[PDB]
């Protein structure tokens, strides 16, 4: 039962390697923004820019600028990301693209709105840390731009998707402070009940990702589709939502599903828990469904330790510690700094890469800070 | 040099295998159009039409009929797609959808051509096979629409991609009998030329995927990609092409460049070739890069024993060999039949399943069927 180095872990894999490999090789001091696309070695491979990860990038920073330490390094990294995207980062109607140049050319437009979503969350929080008051209409224009668009995000088969109320429900978080009270109180109990009606599948115990809008199942490849890491990432944001109203039920009911999605989804073989799953047994149309990704496993560690910090359920302690052995043991590279993102079902590196198209400074940062978080709340009342 | 044993094993396998396997399990005789969502042992595990796989499998009992033999039950198999399809296939614009429910009712409209492309090349064929006058036209209006969309098919960082020359080259074979002889041979003389300036690499010897306008490299995620069996593809298309004027340097030079790649894209340590390879060495974007998929080595079949007969040189008949010997041991089924799709790089099962959302009856099929008459004419001088 050590908590407190646990707790130690974590912030030293933060601070120490984490971070410092970001701060080190993903700068683009001369043009703005961050090169993502990063070797095993921190090596740039490719220059152009994916405003996901840019904005996630200036999230990072700024969050932990405003809530950890304000290291005037942090917000300088920060501002360096939201100044080059309030430059280039949307188009004439204020929609944000999906990538750009280097020098912040538009390459990109997209359909979806997880764009406008991490450009929302991290004008936010620029605001906040940068005392950069511009920064909050940036952030409200994105945010409701998602709200907007949310349901059509981009006859025959109406479905809609986890990942919509999934984004909508987190990111109400983050622009909390820029909100009306009531406005975050309605959105949040209304995208968790949506989940935790619609999506959770009350008979299986299980996430599924597209449903009908009535919350029924449809016999397809969509309706059929588990992607466990999703389901559990969703069901600690659910934690972190109903903690608020020390809604204890649903704190509750949330750690049974995360149970439940580990036990279905763990690879006897290998260890580890598979990307997708088709629920009813059949083959996946997706080729990667049986890789081992990091943020699957790193959303699995936050919900297990903000699970047994929120209801002291031996069961996640238990989970923990198997999720710990494997994660640590296949993603953290100790030698060159940072986690690998991709490896494939036996656990080998299948990527030689830290950062890419779709890895950034976002998924491994939150979680190890929020790891630690839950391990420091244990060791020590607040 | 046992050439007629190659001869009969593919004829075998096309004929008492293969086609047989679709014949068994594939069939909606109730509602009209094919299932393609069939497990290893010939099970039903999703009941949506896959517009693509539904043209291919019309195409290919079509072709049959016409050249080799005139069943009455492989006409009656092409009909029960063509008038399916020709009921429910397009939107009211004449374009083509990507998949309808088994009824036939429409999920997904496409963005691309290769619906309409798949349509023409069906159509036409069947036009011949059954002596239906009605499908000319059918394919005649789905010819024009991939011309008419070939340069956008769906400023910045202009680029073209490779596929689009490709199927129209090969198209406009299978459209010749309806076409005025000069446009066939305009198109088709443009196309190899676009082909064989532009998207092969004269340095490399390789087939990139992804160009500029005028043939240069951009170092991008798209601009570095490779596809070994694409570019092998595309090289027997040319072969044939070229064979028609006997254009006996341009037969060689698709067959360095077939070479070229199976040295470039084998898998050293287990046998195989890559699906993706990114031309520089970074790593690619691609999670599925490293799998073995069975129409990458079954065109490879194809190229090589096409190449051989073109050409007699020995390098063909050495990789031939090679290539043999790792695809009928990996990939054939000699249990339930057919061939699996979807193996990852060790060359294990992947998906178990003998077609899909993307696999049917036509790459096999047609495969075995040009195998055959390759190494026929090479036995038996015509
Ligand atoms: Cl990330
Ligand atoms: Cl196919």
């Keep these: 039962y050590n908590f407190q180095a646990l707790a130690e872990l974590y912030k030293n894999a933060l601070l120490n390697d984490v971070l410092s490999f970001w701060e080190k090789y993903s700068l683009d001091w001369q043009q703005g923004g961050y090169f993502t696309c990063l070797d095993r070695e921190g090596k740039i491979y490719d220059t152009d820019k994916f405003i996901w990860l840019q904005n996630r990038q200036v999230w990072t920073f700024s969050m932990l600028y405003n809530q950890l330490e304000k290291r005037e390094n942090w917000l300088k990294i920060a501002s360096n990301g939201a100044n080059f995207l309030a430059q280039h980062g949307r188009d004439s109607d204020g929609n944000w693209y999906f990538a750009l140049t280097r020098e912040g050319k538009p390459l990109v437009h997209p359909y979806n709105i997880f764009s406008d979503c991490f450009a929302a969350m991290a004008f936010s929080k620029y605001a906040l840390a940068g005392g950069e008051e511009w920064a909050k209409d940036v952030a409200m224009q994105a945010y409701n731009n998602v709200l ?17 109320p999934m984004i909508l429900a987190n990111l109400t978080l983050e622009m909390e402070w820029l909100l009306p009270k009531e406005t975050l109180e309605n959105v949040l109990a209304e995208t968790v009940r949506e989940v935790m009606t619609d999506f959770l599948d009350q008979e299986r115990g299980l996430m599924y990702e597209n449903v009908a809008p009535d919350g029924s199942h449809i016999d397809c490849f969509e309706g059929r589709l588990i992607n466990p890491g ?15 109203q020390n809604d204890t039920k649903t704190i509750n009911q949330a750690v049974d599903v995360v149970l439940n999605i580990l036990n279905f989804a763990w690879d006897s073989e290998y260890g580890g828990l598979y990307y997708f799953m088709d629920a009813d047994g059949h083959p996946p149309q997706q080729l990667e469904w049986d890789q081992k990704l ?11 330790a903000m699970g047994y910090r929120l209801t002291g359920r031996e069961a996640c302690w238990e989970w923990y510690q198997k999720m710990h052995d494997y994660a640590w043991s296949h993603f953290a590279d100790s030698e060159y700094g940072e986690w690998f993102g991709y490896l494939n079902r036996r656990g080998e590196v299948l990527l030689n890469l830290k950062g890419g198209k779709w890895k950034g400074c976002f998924h491994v940062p939150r979680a190890l800070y929020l790891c630690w978080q839950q391990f420091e709340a244990i060791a020590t009342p607040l």
Tied chains: 1, 2.
């Design 148 to 164: 907007r668009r949310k349901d059509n995000p981009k006859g025959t088969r109406p479905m809609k998707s986890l990942a919509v």
């Design 230 to 244: 999703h389901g559990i990432e969703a069901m600690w944001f659910i934690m972190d939502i109903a903690r608020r």
């Design 294 to 304: 990091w943020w699957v496993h790193l959303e699995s560690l936050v919900a297990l």
